[PDB]
Amino acid sequence: MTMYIAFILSTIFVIGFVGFSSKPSPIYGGLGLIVSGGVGCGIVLNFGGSFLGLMVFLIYLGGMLVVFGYTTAMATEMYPEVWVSNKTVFGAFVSGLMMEFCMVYYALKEEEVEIIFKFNGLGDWVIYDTGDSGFFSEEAMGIAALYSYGTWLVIVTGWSLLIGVVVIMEITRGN
Amino acid sequence: MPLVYMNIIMAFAIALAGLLMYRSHLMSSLLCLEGMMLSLFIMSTLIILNTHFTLANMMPIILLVFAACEAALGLSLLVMVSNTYGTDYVQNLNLLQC
Amino acid sequence: AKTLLHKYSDIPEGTECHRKAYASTSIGGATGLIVSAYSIALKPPASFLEGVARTGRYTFTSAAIGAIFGLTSCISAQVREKPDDPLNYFIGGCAGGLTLGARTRSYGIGAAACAYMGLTAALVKMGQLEGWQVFAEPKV
Amino acid sequence: KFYIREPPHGSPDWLKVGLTLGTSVFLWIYLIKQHKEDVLEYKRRNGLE
Amino acid sequence: ARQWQPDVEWAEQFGGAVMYPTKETAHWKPPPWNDVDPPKDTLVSNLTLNFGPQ
Amino acid sequence: TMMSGRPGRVPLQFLPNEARSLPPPKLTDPRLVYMGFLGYCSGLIDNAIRRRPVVSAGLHRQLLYVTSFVFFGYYLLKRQDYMYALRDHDMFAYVKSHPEDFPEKDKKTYGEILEEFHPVR
Amino acid sequence: SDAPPLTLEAIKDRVLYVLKLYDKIDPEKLSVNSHFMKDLGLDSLDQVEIIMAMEDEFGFEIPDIDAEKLMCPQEIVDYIADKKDVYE
Amino acid sequence: MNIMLTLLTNVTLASLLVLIAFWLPQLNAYSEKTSPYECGFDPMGSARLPFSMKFFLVAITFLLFDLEIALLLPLPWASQTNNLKTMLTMALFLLILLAASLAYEWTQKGLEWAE
Amino acid sequence: MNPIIYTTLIMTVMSGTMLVMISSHWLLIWIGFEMNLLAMIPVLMKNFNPRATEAATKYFLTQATASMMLMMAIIINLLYSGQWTITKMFNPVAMTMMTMALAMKLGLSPFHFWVPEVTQGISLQAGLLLLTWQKLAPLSVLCQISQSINPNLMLTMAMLSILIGGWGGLNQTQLRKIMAYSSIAHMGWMTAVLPYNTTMTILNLLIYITMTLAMFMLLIHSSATTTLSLSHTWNKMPVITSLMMVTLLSMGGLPPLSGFMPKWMIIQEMTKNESIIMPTLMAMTALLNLYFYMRLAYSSSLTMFPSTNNMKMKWQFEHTKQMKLLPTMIVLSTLVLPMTPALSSLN
Ligand SMILES: CCCCCCCCCCCCCCCCCC(=O)OC[C@H](COP(=O)([O-])OCC(O)COP(=O)([O-])OC[C@@H](COC(=O)CCCCCCCCCCCCCCCCC)OC(=O)CCCCCCCCCCCCCCCCC)OC(=O)CCCCCCCCCCCCCCCCC
Ligand SMILES: CCCCCCCCCCCCCCCCCC(=O)OC[C@H](COP(=O)([O-])OCC(O)COP(=O)([O-])OC[C@@H](COC(=O)CCCCCCCCCCCCCCCCC)OC(=O)CCCCCCCCCCCCCCCCC)OC(=O)CCCCCCCCCCCCCCCCC
Ligand SMILES: CCCCCCCCCCCCCCCCCC(=O)OC[C@H](COP(=O)([O-])OCC(O)COP(=O)([O-])OC[C@@H](COC(=O)CCCCCCCCCCCCCCCCC)OC(=O)CCCCCCCCCCCCCCCCC)OC(=O)CCCCCCCCCCCCCCCCC
Ligand SMILES: CCCCCCCCCCCCCCCCC[C@@H](O)O[C@H](CO[C@H](O)CCCCCCCCCCCCCCC)COP(=O)(O)OCC[N+](C)(C)C
Ligand SMILES: CCCCCCCCCCCCCCCCC[C@@H](O)O[C@H](CO[C@H](O)CCCCCCCCCCCCCCC)COP(=O)(O)OCC[N+](C)(C)C
Ligand SMILES: *OP(=O)(O)OCC(C)(C)[C@@H](O)C(=O)NCCC(=O)NCCSC(=O)CCCCCCCCCCC
């Protein structure tokens, strides 16, 4: 009940997911995914994870640029579909919006279980920690621990990346 | 469970439903897969930030890495599909019916 | 869910045949709805109206079978004054089988369905009486 | 006869034959020695002999 | 006088796309002997561009 | 499930130390002879598949087949015997330590027990 | 399955439908053996248009030669039957 | 809080500029003025037709290398750990694997555009 | 494709499976699944044709959706208990998600649709790999968390798998689809005993892998992918067809062959619990698998089909490359029942 900023961001996150889940041509799908990526960056920034939000935003911006190129190359049609240009896309979009609103109403009005367990709301500020400690940041130190603690993770990840380069070359080789 | 958690789980459910329904394009399904990755990343980050699991902070990053791999894989496959048919329509992938 | 089975089972065997028939037709409608959903998913009907027609046909057939089974079995148990006996269930099942034959307009299906359904119904009653478990909980 | 040289030589491949026989004898000797060792160890543990 | 062994007519019933041919699957065809379907003669749609006069 | 987590168990040992306190299977154990027979059958099938005289194509490789099967079977039998011995040990100890769950009932003679008689006719 | 076992009656009905939809042919004067030149008073270009209408109705290319000699609806029906091996 | 205000101000200023651009001048649009632009003539096809891309492989490799960048970014903080030897070894391992993948794509003619 | 690259890809697939097997962290098991899928996709596409591309795309889509559900279940479990270790899985919703994800990865019904098509679309070597090695990691994960298996859900999926495999195999002429449906039925048999005894699961898995390896190596020796092309083998390799018939009878579950041992044990195990109706239904349904195995045996070994004239030329040439372990796999696939008690060395 305090400026609802986190709630508004999460709602826009769901709206963007509904937007690109209706599958209204991959150009607009990428627009929706970019909006959701930025909004999620904000969501996790509001919890103290600034590096992670910026990183996911950067990664998804690059990925959506590549997806835009691929959509122009091999996923296009004479009349690309937008959210209002087709009955199925519009119906899915409106159904997703209405179901999100019904969920939000059912949660705010009553503390009733939907899928996993009954929720409370009350503003996500309540569950914070009152942590007064540090001349560093916990998120940055935890992520930097990947090179001192996570040797095994670095090994498996680097191997997977090299194998991925080899794999894409082999797949697209052709013949 | 806070309301933001509920919104993130709803986003994941929406992306999964969007993937399990195919319209025509394979690129749209790949986009739904990437959305599922994004929702999983946000969920993991929120859980790890709320409960101050310090060593778990690298976990979302690794997640993102393999996300790219999947994306890369899908994109590679899509190229081949296009090279066989000129379109990325999933209806052309019906040879193994018989 | 399984709460429909509870609403069906909580009614005593030879009492309130109307409520038992209602519970049975609820179970039949649920099963027919699931079957219609899977049939539409795997075999598209080429149009929305044909899809709703197939859904309604399957759901009505299943609901009629369930209602006839429940009504006939309850009436037999109450009239014969012999509950906890699988003949009532067998009779209900055969009647349910007959309904399927009438819905599909085929004597073989009706006759074949009646014997199999009746046998199946009797086996379920015996399992309820004795305590047979289809999904046994791991004990050893 | 045979127009081709019959890759598997008309005389046996003495290297392969020697190595196969050698691993057979080695496995048999190892098994016998191991069986003796477990017999002795089992007798020692249980106070038999 | 001799034991019966299958003939061409007998063996041809195992040579279809599926067993138990039906109305819906009558028009199915067995896959190619080597699993290579013939390439489609897809028309390569080039981009036609006016370069000039302005 | 039942035996995967047992206290004092080395993960990938395949033969704990206490297993040496058990009698080793004899070299003439019929299960070992059956393993040797399996090796002989594998050798004969190998001869037949490569289109060679089945009984007398390669005697050295048939001997290797038989000895390999016998070699593996000896340790397989040792481990099987050890695991059965462990099962029996644990069951007996559990019976001993929970007497109220395994009580010795009263011994009755057939002169006292009344069994119903069902005539055949 | 695919399209049903098309017979001669359906072929004749569709050919006659095509001719009735043509705006240069009087429907009442048109019959099965009406010559395209001497009963309906058309020239070769109307005949070409009618052959093209057959081509886009029956969905198979009809080339010159053994198509310039299609002068009544009857020969059109026979040509379609011979092409599709329709005997009933 | 202040970044929200900054972004709102910038977006509102750009939107106001567009609004002035579209409502101040005199608009006179007919069919020939709004037609698609070609050097002098009318286009043959559409701009929505597929446009072949000759560097698709480089684009996928760019995705992978971009993720390698996210792996490399926490290095300034990683350099402050007590055990610098394992940290340096692991960072050099990551960069060497990146270089090896680049070399593999290069030598197998992966960096060349489709002809 | 280069032999070194093929070796590296196979080693990466195997290392992903081993990483899933030796990990105590959920993230590492997920990473193993990811690495396995990533290296597996090109192996299915080694011989390039549109059918292989189709099979690779379908396999990728199925496994990617399964990976998403796997990670979501892991994250929900973490949310409701801050534990990364693979254990009892304190949350039931996450447990259902995990069970469904692993079932989709294995191919259990109703997630079975991809298996026959992917198997038919790839070569016999890739099919061997897919139907033998790819079943280890999901089954290992399922074995580790069997304490929280919902018996209703798992047993329903297992019975559905057995029924669907039996029914689907009856309609098939191609050999790869027959192997796929037999694989689905055997997966159902394997997972039916999972909530009761994982040792029986491992025993059934080993017997199934031995029989499947024997079947695939026989089908590679006689380069046959259809029923009628296998009908020609008696005129060139009668011994191969006889061995194939005995192997098929073993897979049909007839005693005293090896394929009888797993189901027998499994039945006994479920009878140690109450569980009487289910084993009966599973046996009467495995009758269908035996039926289409016997149909294949009739076509290939117990009758002599007509041949062609060119076959005479093939009479003059031997096999250039011989697959090792084929005789051993045949023997282990047929004459192993007398050594049944040795399963005690599996727990
Ligand atoms: C965390 C775990 C959970 C994860 C999952 C969570 C899921 C929830 C989040 C979902 C968010 C949605 C946001 C976007 C989704 C993306 C959709 C998409 O991409 O569209 C692609 C897909 C492909 O479109 P397209 O290829 O571009 O266009 C070509 C035509 O569509 C096709 O060409 P055509 O015209 O030639 O074909 C003929 C015509 C044929 O059309 C039909 O035949 C459909 C008519 C069926 C009649 C329905 C029953 C009527 C009476 C039932 C009454 C209920 C009980 C009342 C009492 C008893 C009544 C007697 O069209 C069809 O074939 C459509 C068949 C599929 C229908 C929709 C499939 C949904 C599931 C299957 C339902 C089956 C209904 C049977 C009964 C089920 C039990 C009630 O679009 C469609 O399938 C059409 C409808 C899509 C709009 C609605 C989407 C909402 C559905 C979401 C899930 C369902 C409810 C979930 C609520 C859960 C509670 C909270
Ligand atoms: C192990 C040792 C050996 C045993 C193995 C061998 C024996 C067992 C197998 C053989 C018998 C089983 C056959 C099953 C039924 C076959 C029907 C069929 O396949 O449909 C396809 C087949 C052709 O398919 P479709 O194209 O849809 O039909 C076109 C028709 O051609 C066009 O037809 P339509 O237009 O001309 O007329 C149709 C209409 C008009 O009907 C007719 O056309 C003629 C009338 C036929 C049935 C009416 C009964 C009249 C004669 C009976 C009088 C009393 C007999 C003595 C009984 C008391 C003993 C003292 O039919 C009906 O509506 C008949 C309704 C049914 C009423 C009958 C109820 C009898 C229940 C049994 C009570 C007694 C149980 C024994 C207790 C003994 C205790 C000591 O349908 C038929 O043609 C036959 C339909 C007539 C049903 C006859 C059933 C009566 C036989 C007794 C069955 C009981 C045995 C099994 C017990 C459980 C069964 C529920
Ligand atoms: C339970 C008690 C014990 C029983 C255990 C089980 C049975 C025994 C073990 C089975 C495995 C052993 C060997 C397997 C490979 C052999 C394959 C073969 O072809 O053999 C050819 C070979 C003769 O061929 P050859 O001389 O090289 O030249 C002729 C050409 O090769 C000519 O070649 P080809 O190309 O002209 O041949 C074509 C022919 C070739 O087709 C075949 O030969 C069939 C191959 C058998 C399949 C084996 C699969 C794995 C074993 C499973 C057995 C299941 C048993 C459970 C009950 C269910 C029955 C299925 O195919 C056909 O013509 C189509 C006929 C279709 C009939 C379908 C039935 C086939 C399945 C029958 C399986 C039953 C077991 C047979 C055992 C004996 C067979 C040799 O046979 C032998 O000489 C080996 C016999 C055993 C050697 C023992 C001699 C040792 C020394 C004797 C003294 C003993 C100790 C002395 C000390 C005492 C103090 C003095
Ligand atoms: C048809 C027959 C199929 C058999 C398959 C191939 C047969 C040869 C098997 C190869 C033997 C080498 C494997 C292991 C040897 C050394 C490694 C050792 O450390 O393994 C330990 C023990 O070795 C293996 O676990 C046992 C392998 C024995 C296989 C033979 C049993 C076959 C089933 C009975 C059918 C009869 C076949 C007769 C011989 C052909 C593992 O201990 P543990 O960490 O705790 O296990 C973790 C997983 N658990 C607890 C769930 C089991
Ligand atoms: C750079 C960022 C900071 C900028 C800060 C200043 C913001 C400026 C506000 C933006 C508008 C400036 C544009 C300059 C001229 C205004 C043009 C337009 O907005 O006015 C009319 C829009 O009005 C409507 O068209 C007709 C009026 C009917 C509606 C009544 C007004 C609504 C309020 C209700 C009545 C109250 C009147 C005011 C008393 C409070 C023109 O309509 P139209 O002819 O199409 O367009 C042609 C304009 N031409 C002629 C100059 C070429
Ligand atoms: O049915 P037939 O008896 O064969 O009659 C044939 C014909 C009527 C032509 C008859 O008079 C004839 O054969 N005359 C002999 C001369 C001759 O054949 N002349 C043909 C002239 S060819 C020609 O001029 C091509 C003109 C192309 C112009 C295209 C205009 C496009 C308009 C813009 C569209 C938007």
Side-chain angles (χ1 to χ4, degrees), chain E residues 5-8 10-11 14-20 31-32 35-37, chain I residues 49 51 120 170-174 176 227-228 295 299 303-306:
Chain E
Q5 291 290 343
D7 51 333
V8 167
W10 180 272
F14 308 95
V18 305
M19 304 273 208
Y20 323 132
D35 312 290
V36 178
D37 297 77
Chain I
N49 46 49
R51 264 151 206 267
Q120 165 74 8
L170 287 178
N171 203 199
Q172 300 317 127
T173 296
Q174 312 286 306
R176 284 175 284 198
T227 283
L228 281 200
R295 186 208 282 140
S299 302
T303 54
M304 320 208 280
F305 271 48

Short mmCIF file of all heavy atoms in Angstrom, two decimals, chain E residues 5-8 10-11 14-20 31-32 35-37, chain I residues 49 51 120 170-174 176 227-228 295 299 303-306:
data_model
loop_
_atom_site.label_atom_id
_atom_site.label_comp_id
_atom_site.label_asym_id
_atom_site.label_seq_id
_atom_site.Cartn_x
_atom_site.Cartn_y
_atom_site.Cartn_z
N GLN E 5 5.35 -71.75 -48.03
CA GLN E 5 6.14 -70.58 -47.68
C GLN E 5 5.53 -69.35 -48.32
O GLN E 5 4.90 -69.45 -49.38
CB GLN E 5 7.60 -70.74 -48.14
CG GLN E 5 8.37 -71.80 -47.38
CD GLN E 5 8.65 -71.40 -45.95
OE1 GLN E 5 8.55 -70.24 -45.58
NE2 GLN E 5 9.01 -72.38 -45.12
N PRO E 6 5.68 -68.18 -47.70
CA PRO E 6 4.97 -66.99 -48.18
C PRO E 6 5.34 -66.61 -49.60
O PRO E 6 6.47 -66.81 -50.05
CB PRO E 6 5.39 -65.90 -47.19
CG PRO E 6 5.75 -66.64 -45.96
CD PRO E 6 6.34 -67.93 -46.41
N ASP E 7 4.37 -66.05 -50.31
CA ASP E 7 4.55 -65.55 -51.66
C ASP E 7 4.46 -64.03 -51.66
O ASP E 7 4.33 -63.39 -50.61
CB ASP E 7 3.52 -66.19 -52.60
CG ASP E 7 2.10 -66.06 -52.07
OD1 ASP E 7 1.93 -65.98 -50.84
OD2 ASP E 7 1.16 -66.05 -52.89
N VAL E 8 4.51 -63.44 -52.86
CA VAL E 8 4.52 -61.99 -52.99
C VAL E 8 3.24 -61.39 -52.42
O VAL E 8 3.27 -60.35 -51.74
CB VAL E 8 4.73 -61.59 -54.46
CG1 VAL E 8 4.43 -60.11 -54.66
CG2 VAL E 8 6.14 -61.91 -54.90
N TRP E 10 1.36 -62.55 -50.02
CA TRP E 10 1.46 -62.59 -48.56
C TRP E 10 2.38 -61.50 -48.04
O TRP E 10 2.05 -60.81 -47.07
CB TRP E 10 1.95 -63.96 -48.11
CG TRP E 10 2.09 -64.11 -46.64
CD1 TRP E 10 3.18 -63.80 -45.88
CD2 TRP E 10 1.10 -64.61 -45.73
NE1 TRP E 10 2.93 -64.08 -44.56
CE2 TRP E 10 1.66 -64.57 -44.44
CE3 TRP E 10 -0.21 -65.07 -45.89
CZ2 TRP E 10 0.96 -64.99 -43.32
CZ3 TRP E 10 -0.90 -65.48 -44.77
CH2 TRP E 10 -0.31 -65.44 -43.50
N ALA E 11 3.53 -61.31 -48.68
CA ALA E 11 4.51 -60.36 -48.19
C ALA E 11 4.09 -58.92 -48.42
O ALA E 11 4.58 -58.01 -47.74
CB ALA E 11 5.86 -60.62 -48.85
N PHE E 14 2.63 -56.73 -45.47
CA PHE E 14 3.55 -56.15 -44.51
C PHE E 14 4.34 -55.00 -45.11
O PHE E 14 5.24 -54.47 -44.44
CB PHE E 14 4.52 -57.21 -43.98
CG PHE E 14 3.84 -58.43 -43.46
CD1 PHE E 14 3.67 -59.54 -44.26
CD2 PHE E 14 3.39 -58.48 -42.16
CE1 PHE E 14 3.05 -60.67 -43.78
CE2 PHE E 14 2.77 -59.61 -41.67
CZ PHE E 14 2.60 -60.70 -42.48
N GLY E 15 4.05 -54.60 -46.34
CA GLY E 15 4.82 -53.60 -47.04
C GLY E 15 4.21 -52.22 -47.10
O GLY E 15 4.75 -51.36 -47.81
N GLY E 16 3.12 -51.97 -46.39
CA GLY E 16 2.47 -50.68 -46.44
C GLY E 16 3.06 -49.69 -45.46
O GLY E 16 4.08 -49.92 -44.82
N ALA E 17 2.39 -48.54 -45.36
CA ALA E 17 2.81 -47.51 -44.42
C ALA E 17 2.58 -47.96 -42.98
O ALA E 17 3.47 -47.83 -42.13
CB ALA E 17 2.06 -46.21 -44.70
N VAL E 18 1.39 -48.47 -42.69
CA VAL E 18 1.06 -49.04 -41.39
C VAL E 18 0.30 -50.33 -41.61
O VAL E 18 -0.16 -50.63 -42.71
CB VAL E 18 0.22 -48.08 -40.51
CG1 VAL E 18 0.91 -46.74 -40.34
CG2 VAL E 18 -1.16 -47.90 -41.10
N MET E 19 0.18 -51.12 -40.55
CA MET E 19 -0.71 -52.26 -40.57
C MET E 19 -2.14 -51.79 -40.35
O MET E 19 -2.38 -50.69 -39.83
CB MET E 19 -0.31 -53.27 -39.50
CG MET E 19 1.13 -53.73 -39.64
SD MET E 19 1.35 -55.11 -40.76
CE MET E 19 2.80 -55.84 -40.04
N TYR E 20 -3.09 -52.62 -40.74
CA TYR E 20 -4.51 -52.27 -40.68
C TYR E 20 -4.76 -50.95 -41.39
O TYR E 20 -5.00 -49.93 -40.74
CB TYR E 20 -4.99 -52.17 -39.23
CG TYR E 20 -4.38 -53.18 -38.29
CD1 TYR E 20 -3.87 -52.79 -37.06
CD2 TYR E 20 -4.31 -54.52 -38.63
CE1 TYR E 20 -3.31 -53.71 -36.21
CE2 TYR E 20 -3.75 -55.44 -37.78
CZ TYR E 20 -3.25 -55.03 -36.57
OH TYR E 20 -2.70 -55.96 -35.72
N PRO E 31 8.05 -44.37 -46.25
CA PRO E 31 9.17 -43.44 -46.41
C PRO E 31 10.14 -43.92 -47.48
O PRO E 31 10.12 -45.10 -47.86
CB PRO E 31 9.83 -43.44 -45.02
CG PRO E 31 9.39 -44.70 -44.39
CD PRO E 31 8.02 -44.96 -44.91
N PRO E 32 10.99 -43.03 -47.99
CA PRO E 32 11.96 -43.45 -49.01
C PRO E 32 12.93 -44.49 -48.48
O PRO E 32 13.18 -44.58 -47.28
CB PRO E 32 12.68 -42.14 -49.37
CG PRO E 32 12.40 -41.22 -48.23
CD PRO E 32 11.05 -41.58 -47.74
N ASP E 35 16.59 -42.65 -46.11
CA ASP E 35 15.68 -41.71 -45.48
C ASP E 35 15.96 -40.28 -45.93
O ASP E 35 16.17 -39.39 -45.10
CB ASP E 35 15.78 -41.82 -43.96
CG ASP E 35 15.72 -43.25 -43.48
OD1 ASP E 35 14.63 -43.86 -43.57
OD2 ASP E 35 16.75 -43.77 -43.03
N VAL E 36 15.93 -40.05 -47.24
CA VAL E 36 16.20 -38.75 -47.83
C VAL E 36 15.00 -38.40 -48.70
O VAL E 36 14.83 -38.97 -49.78
CB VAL E 36 17.49 -38.71 -48.64
CG1 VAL E 36 17.68 -37.35 -49.27
CG2 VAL E 36 18.68 -39.06 -47.76
N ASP E 37 14.17 -37.47 -48.24
CA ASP E 37 13.08 -36.98 -49.06
C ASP E 37 13.63 -36.07 -50.15
O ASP E 37 14.63 -35.37 -49.95
CB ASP E 37 12.08 -36.21 -48.20
CG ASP E 37 11.42 -37.09 -47.16
OD1 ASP E 37 12.07 -37.37 -46.14
OD2 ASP E 37 10.26 -37.50 -47.36
N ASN I 49 19.37 -34.90 -43.36
CA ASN I 49 18.23 -34.96 -44.26
C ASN I 49 17.06 -34.29 -43.56
O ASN I 49 17.11 -34.06 -42.35
CB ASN I 49 17.90 -36.41 -44.66
CG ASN I 49 17.88 -37.36 -43.49
OD1 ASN I 49 17.26 -37.10 -42.47
ND2 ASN I 49 18.56 -38.48 -43.64
N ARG I 51 14.24 -35.35 -42.57
CA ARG I 51 13.68 -36.13 -41.48
C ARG I 51 14.52 -36.00 -40.21
O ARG I 51 13.97 -35.90 -39.10
CB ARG I 51 13.57 -37.60 -41.90
CG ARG I 51 12.19 -37.96 -42.40
CD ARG I 51 12.24 -39.07 -43.41
NE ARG I 51 11.09 -39.01 -44.31
CZ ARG I 51 9.95 -39.66 -44.12
NH1 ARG I 51 9.78 -40.46 -43.08
NH2 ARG I 51 8.96 -39.50 -44.99
N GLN I 120 12.15 -42.82 -35.40
CA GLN I 120 12.03 -43.12 -36.82
C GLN I 120 12.83 -42.14 -37.67
O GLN I 120 13.33 -42.51 -38.74
CB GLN I 120 10.56 -43.11 -37.22
CG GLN I 120 10.28 -43.05 -38.71
CD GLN I 120 10.55 -44.37 -39.40
OE1 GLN I 120 10.80 -45.39 -38.76
NE2 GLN I 120 10.49 -44.36 -40.72
N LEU I 170 1.25 -52.38 -32.25
CA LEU I 170 0.50 -53.31 -33.09
C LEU I 170 0.34 -52.79 -34.51
O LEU I 170 0.18 -53.58 -35.45
CB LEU I 170 -0.87 -53.58 -32.49
CG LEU I 170 -0.95 -54.46 -31.25
CD1 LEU I 170 -2.38 -54.57 -30.77
CD2 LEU I 170 -0.39 -55.82 -31.56
N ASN I 171 0.37 -51.47 -34.70
CA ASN I 171 0.06 -50.85 -35.97
C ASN I 171 1.29 -50.56 -36.82
O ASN I 171 1.15 -49.99 -37.90
CB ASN I 171 -0.71 -49.55 -35.73
CG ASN I 171 -1.54 -49.13 -36.92
OD1 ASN I 171 -1.92 -47.97 -37.04
ND2 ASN I 171 -1.83 -50.07 -37.80
N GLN I 172 2.47 -50.95 -36.36
CA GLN I 172 3.72 -50.45 -36.93
C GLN I 172 4.33 -51.47 -37.88
O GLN I 172 4.35 -52.67 -37.59
CB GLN I 172 4.71 -50.09 -35.83
CG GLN I 172 4.22 -49.02 -34.88
CD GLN I 172 3.53 -47.87 -35.58
OE1 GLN I 172 2.41 -47.51 -35.24
NE2 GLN I 172 4.21 -47.28 -36.56
N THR I 173 4.83 -50.97 -39.01
CA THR I 173 5.61 -51.74 -39.97
C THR I 173 7.10 -51.40 -39.91
O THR I 173 7.94 -52.28 -40.09
CB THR I 173 5.08 -51.49 -41.39
OG1 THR I 173 3.74 -51.98 -41.49
CG2 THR I 173 5.94 -52.19 -42.42
N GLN I 174 7.43 -50.14 -39.65
CA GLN I 174 8.83 -49.75 -39.52
C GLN I 174 9.42 -50.26 -38.22
O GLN I 174 8.74 -50.31 -37.19
CB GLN I 174 8.95 -48.23 -39.59
CG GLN I 174 8.20 -47.60 -40.74
CD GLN I 174 8.88 -47.84 -42.07
OE1 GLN I 174 10.06 -47.54 -42.25
NE2 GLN I 174 8.13 -48.39 -43.02
N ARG I 176 12.01 -49.03 -36.41
CA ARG I 176 12.39 -48.02 -35.42
C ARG I 176 11.20 -47.60 -34.57
O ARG I 176 11.34 -47.39 -33.36
CB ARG I 176 13.02 -46.82 -36.12
CG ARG I 176 14.44 -47.07 -36.58
CD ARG I 176 14.99 -45.92 -37.39
NE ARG I 176 14.45 -45.90 -38.74
CZ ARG I 176 14.98 -45.24 -39.75
NH1 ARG I 176 16.08 -44.52 -39.61
NH2 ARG I 176 14.39 -45.29 -40.94
N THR I 227 9.99 -53.97 -42.12
CA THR I 227 9.67 -55.39 -41.98
C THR I 227 10.09 -56.17 -43.22
O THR I 227 10.67 -57.26 -43.13
CB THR I 227 8.18 -55.57 -41.71
OG1 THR I 227 7.90 -55.25 -40.34
CG2 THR I 227 7.75 -56.99 -41.99
N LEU I 228 9.80 -55.63 -44.41
CA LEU I 228 10.08 -56.36 -45.63
C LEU I 228 11.57 -56.40 -45.95
O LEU I 228 12.04 -57.37 -46.56
CB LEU I 228 9.31 -55.75 -46.80
CG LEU I 228 7.84 -56.14 -46.90
CD1 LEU I 228 7.35 -55.88 -48.31
CD2 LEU I 228 7.63 -57.58 -46.52
N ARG I 295 4.91 -61.34 -34.33
CA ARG I 295 4.66 -61.00 -35.73
C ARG I 295 5.97 -60.72 -36.47
O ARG I 295 6.19 -61.20 -37.59
CB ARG I 295 3.72 -59.80 -35.81
CG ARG I 295 3.28 -59.46 -37.20
CD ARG I 295 2.96 -57.99 -37.32
NE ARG I 295 1.66 -57.63 -36.75
CZ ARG I 295 1.43 -56.54 -36.05
NH1 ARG I 295 2.39 -55.68 -35.76
NH2 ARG I 295 0.19 -56.29 -35.63
N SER I 299 7.69 -62.87 -39.60
CA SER I 299 8.16 -62.29 -40.86
C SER I 299 9.64 -62.58 -41.11
O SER I 299 10.04 -62.75 -42.27
CB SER I 299 7.91 -60.79 -40.88
OG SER I 299 6.53 -60.50 -40.71
N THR I 303 9.43 -68.01 -41.11
CA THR I 303 9.00 -68.23 -42.48
C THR I 303 10.04 -67.65 -43.42
O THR I 303 10.80 -66.75 -43.05
CB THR I 303 7.63 -67.60 -42.77
OG1 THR I 303 7.65 -66.21 -42.41
CG2 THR I 303 6.54 -68.30 -41.98
N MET I 304 10.08 -68.17 -44.64
CA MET I 304 11.01 -67.72 -45.67
C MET I 304 10.24 -66.87 -46.67
O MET I 304 9.38 -67.39 -47.39
CB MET I 304 11.68 -68.91 -46.34
CG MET I 304 12.04 -70.02 -45.38
SD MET I 304 13.46 -70.97 -45.94
CE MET I 304 12.67 -72.05 -47.13
N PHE I 305 10.55 -65.59 -46.71
CA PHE I 305 9.90 -64.67 -47.62
C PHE I 305 10.59 -64.68 -48.98
O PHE I 305 11.74 -65.12 -49.10
CB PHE I 305 9.91 -63.26 -47.03
CG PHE I 305 8.72 -62.96 -46.17
CD1 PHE I 305 8.32 -63.85 -45.18
CD2 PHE I 305 8.01 -61.79 -46.33
CE1 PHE I 305 7.24 -63.57 -44.39
CE2 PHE I 305 6.92 -61.51 -45.53
CZ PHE I 305 6.53 -62.40 -44.56
N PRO I 306 9.91 -64.23 -50.03
CA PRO I 306 10.56 -64.15 -51.34
C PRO I 306 11.72 -63.16 -51.34
O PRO I 306 11.72 -62.18 -50.60
CB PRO I 306 9.43 -63.68 -52.27
CG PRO I 306 8.42 -63.09 -51.37
CD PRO I 306 8.49 -63.87 -50.11
#
